[PDB]
């Protein structure tokens, strides 16, 4: 039961349609708990999970204050990076950001993170040692040198080692029922004949939380990923996740295949077979 808190943001310029849009959002694991949107008509940091709504006005005032500061800083960063690449004022660009901490069963804090992406491309990252940066190209080297000279790593490390860890612990306690659950998947295998030579076996995992799951089909069983169709894990809409894994087998051959399911909410991992 590993846990993480992440803050993300996206600044998207739209020349000739106003200031760049800025969105920011915080997650614990796969649950969004906070959200800011500069297009809202009254931009502020807003609750997205019931357990954060018990924070008082000082918290919301400071989160809204800091996030507005970040919006303006990332709008400035869009301008700065447009120059580094010598791109035209008429063109649109995306600056994305991620900051976060991973705790570890115990503990605590196996990993801090901080990264920027520019137009979908890795730009600048804080290294695992949290004392040094990796820049993806020459433009980014300017940003890197600027962070080095201003000693910014130390300030990021202090948030990651201190504030990020402590508040993650707070949220995990306040939303214990939502966050420290482990809903196992409801699982079944469906059978889809093709007269009279083969059929498709589909292993379903449904209503599970968190997202991390592993489905695998095996014959005898000795495990074929190549012929397996595995969909991307998807949201149900009610907070839980879904996934399936399909394999086309020869007819009369179905009980030689078995589906393996591994997930935090399981006991003891699951083995399934069609009937």
């Amino acid at each position: 039961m590993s846990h993480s808190m992440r803050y993300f943001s996206a600044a998207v310029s739209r020349p000739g349609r106003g200031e760049p849009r800025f969105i920011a959002m915080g997650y614990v694991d796969d649950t969004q708990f906070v959200r800011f949107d500069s297009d809202s008509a009254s931009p502020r940091m807003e609750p997205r999970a019931p357990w954060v709504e018990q924070e008082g006005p000082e918290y919301w005032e400071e989160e809204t204050r800091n996030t507005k500061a970040h919006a303006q800083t990332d709008r400035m960063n869009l301008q700065t990076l447009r120059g580094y690449y010598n791109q035209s004022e008429a063109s649109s660009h995306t600056l994305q950001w991620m900051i976060g901490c991973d705790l570890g069963s115990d503990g605590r804090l196996i990993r801090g993170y901080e990264r920027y992406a520019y137009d979908g491309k890795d730009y600048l990252a804080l290294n695992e040692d949290l004392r040094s940066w990796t820049a993806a190209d020459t433009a980014a080297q300017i940003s890197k040198r600027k962070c080095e000279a201003a000693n910014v790593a130390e300030q990021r490390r202090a948030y990651l080692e201190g504030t990020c860890v402590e508040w993650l612990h707070r949220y995990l306690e306040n939303g214990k029922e939502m966050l420290q659950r482990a809903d196992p998947p409801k699982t079944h295998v469906t059978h889809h004949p093709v007269f009279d030579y083969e059929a498709t076996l589909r292993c379903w995992a449904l209503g599970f939380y968190p997202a991390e799951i592993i489905l695998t089909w095996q014959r005898d069983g000795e495990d074929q990923t190549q012929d397996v169709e595995l969909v991307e894990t998807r949201p149900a809409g009610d907070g839980t996740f879904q996934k399936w894994a399909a394999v086309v087998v020869p007819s009369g051959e179905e009980q030689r295949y078995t589906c393996h399911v591994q997930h935090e909410g399981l006991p003891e991992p699951l083995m399934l077979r069609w009937k």
Binding site: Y7, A24, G26, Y59, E63, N66, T67, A69, H70, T73, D74, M76, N77, T80, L81, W97, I99, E114, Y116, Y123, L124, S143, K146, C147, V152, Q155, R156, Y159, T163, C164, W167
Partner: peptide, 9 residues
């Protein structure tokens, strides 16, 4: 709780 400032690039 988010960080106190963003990074100037």
């Amino acid at each position: 709780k988010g960080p106190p400032a963003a990074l100037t690039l």
